[PDB]
Homo-oligomer: A and B are copies of this chain.
Amino acid sequence: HMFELSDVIEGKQFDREMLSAIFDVAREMEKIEKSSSQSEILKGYLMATLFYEPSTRTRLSFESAMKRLGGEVLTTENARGETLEDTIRTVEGYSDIIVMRHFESGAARKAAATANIPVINAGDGPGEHPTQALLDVYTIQSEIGKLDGISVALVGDLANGRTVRSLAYLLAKFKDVKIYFVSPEIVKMKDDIKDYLTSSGVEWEESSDLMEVASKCDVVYQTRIQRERFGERLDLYEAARGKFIVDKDLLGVMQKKAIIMHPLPRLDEITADVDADPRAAYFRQAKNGLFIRMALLKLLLVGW
């Protein structure tokens, strides 16, 4: 069979049935990485890596995905004049798949249209990051075992957080989900997501009491609250500070089967001695990105 998506660009390309299929493939890719013999699935295929905004973690995730499958890479750490449409039409002559990260929203769409070859969005500015939401939902399926009938908290900057929005969207494709929105009032989630969730059958609750929510949740997804979002209201920052941190006291209330997650990078919103608890899943999360992006590379080049 051949893959049903010609590119990987945005979250709305995915439906529940697809996501389950992709995660099955990702567990095949995990069995490959752990093997001791070098796979040749993608032998002969080249990947161009175009990172107009550089993220070392995310690139090497992708490059490592290509080489763990037997492919090779035409790596470009910056790439930051000429049109993007010209850059893509030229690069596709030297490669078979393109993984781009831009500083401008809309860049992935332009490229996928221009390109005759698969294009994967590794970060379209302030816009969508689909591989990040895919690894986040696969990480939940993997840590908790189920995606139906789960409770997830989304903590931090929800108004302007691009990772929590893209994730909520994808979680909505499953049954019996409840989502908590733990944040200060000034960075609470925006109404297009809330309405999307009510429409999709998702029960949701707003709160400022992280301590109360973590005790009831199957998952705690942490994101930093930047000071910039508080602007002039520094009294609201003062109050907010220290109330939305994952620390040893927060793990006390959490259920033994719950987990802490994080898109990374993280500062002091998660403390170091959380890393000891097996429930801290943000590093297996990052590893899980290797497996998911292996599946996409595989499916986009040689189908199911």
Q: Which residue of B lies closest to A93 (CB)?
A: B287
Integer count of this chain's copies in the complex: 3
Structural contact, B283 and A60, CB atoms closer than 8 A: no
Question: Does A157 have its Cβ within 8 Å of any Cβ on chain B?
Answer: no
- The listed residue (B36, B57, B60, B91) touching A95 by CB distance below 8 A is B60
What are the interface flags for A36-78 relative to B under an 8 Å C-beta threshold, 1 for contact and 0 otherwise? 1110000110101010001011011101110110001111111
Q: Which residue of B lies closest to A64 (CB)?
A: B94
Supposing A64-B46, A67-B46, A290-B93 touch, asked if A86 and B56 sit within 8 A by C-beta, the answer is: no
- The listed residue (B77, B287, B290) touching A76 by CB distance below 8 A is B77
Chain A contact patch, size range? 35 or more
Structural contact, A67 and B72, CB atoms closer than 8 A: yes
Q: A56-B91, A60-B76, A81-B267 are in contact. List 12 more A-B contacts (CB 8 A).
A: A36-B44, A56-B79, A57-B87, A63-B74, A64-B94, A72-B72, A76-B77, A82-B265, A82-B266, A83-B265, A89-B283, A93-B290
The 8 closest A-B pairs by CB, nearest first: A82-B265, A64-B94, A93-B287, A38-B44, A90-B286, A60-B94, A60-B74, A63-B74
